[PDB]
Amino acid sequence: MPVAHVALPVPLPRTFDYLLPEGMTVKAGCRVRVPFGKQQERIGIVVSVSDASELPLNELKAVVEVLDSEPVFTHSVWRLLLWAADYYHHPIGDVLFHALPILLR
Amino acid sequence: MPVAHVALPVPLPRTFDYLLPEGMTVKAGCRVRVPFGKQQERIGIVVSVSDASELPLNELKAVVEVLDSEPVFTHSVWRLLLWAADYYHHPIGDVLFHALPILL
Numbered sequence: 001m002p003v004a005h006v007a008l009p010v011p012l013p014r015t016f017d018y019l020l021p022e023g024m025t026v027k028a029g030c031r032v033r034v035p036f037g038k039q040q041e042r043i044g045i046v047v048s049v050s051d052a053s054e055l056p057l058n059e060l061k062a063v064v065e066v067l068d069s070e071p072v073f074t075h076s077v078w079r080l081l082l083w084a085a086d087y088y089h090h091p092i093g094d095v096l097f098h099a100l101p102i103l104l105r
Numbered sequence: 106m107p108v109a110h111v112a113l114p115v116p117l118p119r120t121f122d123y124l125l126p127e128g129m130t131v132k133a134g135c136r137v138r139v140p141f142g143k144q145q146e147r148i149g150i151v152v153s154v155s156d157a158s159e160l161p162l163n164e165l166k167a168v169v170e171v172l173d174s175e176p177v178f179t180h181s182v183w184r185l186l187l188w189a190a191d192y193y194h195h196p197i198g199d200v201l202f203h204a205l206p207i208l209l
Contacts, residue, residue, distance in 0.1 A: 002162055004131070005120040005153035006139060007198040014119065014196065015110040026109060034111055044111035053108040054142055063109055089195050093112035 029071030134176025
């Protein structure tokens with residue numbers, strides 16, 4: 001009766017909002033360490049950065065650390081990754097994290 | 106800037122939770138109208154009906170109405186559609202909603 005799990009029509013790449021503490025600076029295509037779960041760690045890839053989110057800034061968890069000074073990916077590779085993710089209906093995190101090992105190695 | 110839209114190798118069934126109403130019995134495959142953030146109504150499809158939430162059963166956004174008594178999708182189209190999503194890497198959300206029209 002309680003909790004019901006629903007599926008809702010979401011915006012193209014369903015991303016996760018993290019807050020950037022004062023003094024921290026990131027650009028697209030870079031990796032960061034972020035919180036996940038009431039107390040766990042994990043690695044991600046910034047896809048974009050704006051000045052808004054669905055929830056108030058003060059609610060977003062804060063990015064723990066940036067791993068990449070510059071994009072780990074190439075400018076051309078990156079633009080494509082995002083494109084194929086959008087065009088063929090694949091989760092953006094799914095593509096990126098899968099293609100990183102392939103592309104680097 | 107402030108917010109960072111990060112991508113994560115998130116699980117397969119990324120869904121949202123909404124407390125089911127009293128005397129309101131719904132099952133998987135049925136469309137349901139639920140509040141969407143700071144705002145008003147919007148249609149959604151129930152994938153699962155647990156008894157456990159990630160957040161407290163106090164500050165959980167509730168449900169509204171059950172637009173269907175019987176699952177618009179068949180135990181057959183259902184099985185199939187969830188397989189599609191999982192085998193070809195497509196968000197359940199997207200396969201289900203995009204599929205509904207064609208179905209009707």
